[PDB]
Subunit: 64 residues, 4 copies
Amino acid sequence: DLQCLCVKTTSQVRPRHITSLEVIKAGPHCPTAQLIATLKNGRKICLDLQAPLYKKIIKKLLES
Amino acid sequence: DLQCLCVKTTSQVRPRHITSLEVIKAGPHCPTAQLIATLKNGRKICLDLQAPLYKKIIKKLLES
Amino acid sequence: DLQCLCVKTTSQVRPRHITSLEVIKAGPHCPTAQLIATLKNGRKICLDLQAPLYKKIIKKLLES
Amino acid sequence: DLQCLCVKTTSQVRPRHITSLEVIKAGPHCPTAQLIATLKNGRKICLDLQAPLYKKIIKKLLES
């Protein structure tokens, strides 16, 4: 059995401090895609898939 | 406050299918560590704390 | 010290076959952005930072 | 793709410093378990297996 990781979702994130972004396909464990984002100082946080905000973030991660 | 990321945890994890563990330290961001398990099919789950589960999984990892 | 996780790039990927896709910013780990797609079979491939590929990939991974 | 993240280890670090600590198991990319450690500031160091420090760090981290 086993569950969704992302349910508590934040939008008080500085895109100028995200190191990874992981996009996981919705499936069996969770009926929605989950956007996990590793902040630079260690910690992770789930991102709002209803928020505009993951637009901004992927541009400045692919800009290199 | 919260964004602990892991709020429901688990034990329902077949040890031989977990490819990576992240032990994130607890902090002002969330009062408890998380044991985020990344499994071979991509799916990621937060295991349950303070148990024999972590010496189990960790030594199936500290080898092959 | 760490190096780039990716050492080749993949042009043939069947977009629906991916489960996770992580995007890692450029930094001391490696001067280039990196995109790593876990296939259904636990295979990890990396994709080219300017390919068409991830434009479909993040959409098909967001919807559902 | 085929890369070992850790090209060289990092034989000393204070356990009161590490936030995340990642245990990565062998497979097609590194025939070696790798133990990445993201320090309190941002930059990762890889701890090494067969050695007194990792038991100690994982302890510190888990009590939290």
